[PDB]
Amino acid sequence: ALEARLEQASILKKVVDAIKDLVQDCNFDCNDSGIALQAMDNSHVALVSMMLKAEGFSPYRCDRNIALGVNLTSLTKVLRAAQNEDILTLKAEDAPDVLNLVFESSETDRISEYDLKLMDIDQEHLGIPETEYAATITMPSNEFKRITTDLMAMSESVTIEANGVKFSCQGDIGNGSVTLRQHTNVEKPNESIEIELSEPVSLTFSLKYLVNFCKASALSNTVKICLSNEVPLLVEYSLGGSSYLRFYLAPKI
């Protein structure tokens, strides 16, 4: 019913690793468009939204809608057994009890096969509204990781103001801020900061969660950060084409 082949297991390994500290249990919803995931974190503060499109596989076949109820700690144990450059195939029949994962070595004559027991997970699906955000920041993802990690050492909260963009915090040891200015880097585009702004924004967020979101930095050299006042943060990484991993974070109120 489902047969989905990844030329390189890398991407799925990195996605699950990027998600597993926010989300213990979740459904992988599979259809003809590809494999989607939507789940709130355990504390119902962040939402994780992923879409690996059919075109990202070679080949992809999903004859029917299939929900794969998975524990991510369990899935991580299995995915750790795939090397980054292994060929990875996901299989499942209609109304499945297990997910079948097959890893084929690209370096020697080794086939790994796992039948991962599925669980029953109650949907708890939310609609995400299509939003024209007040501000968008496209920056190097490693830069965003560095900022969130550094500020988290001194504070639990970061204020993000856009007009460039300033990340500020206050804590026991004192105050810290990091200001980024709009800059296109023609020779090293990966270094660029793009800010599209229709309206100034000022919002405060938990750093813990942002730092978790930056576990996804290995997926992409670019991150997109979208802000509106009284509206959740969107932190988005491209997974190639129109595939994506999105994190939504409610502001502190």
Binding site: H44, V45, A46, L126, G127, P129, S206, A250, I253
Partner: peptide, 11 residues
């Protein structure tokens, strides 16, 4: 600290 469910509704 708001809940994400204050902004995103069921379904």
């Amino acid at each position: 600290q708001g809940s994400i469910m204050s902004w995103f509704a069921k379904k």
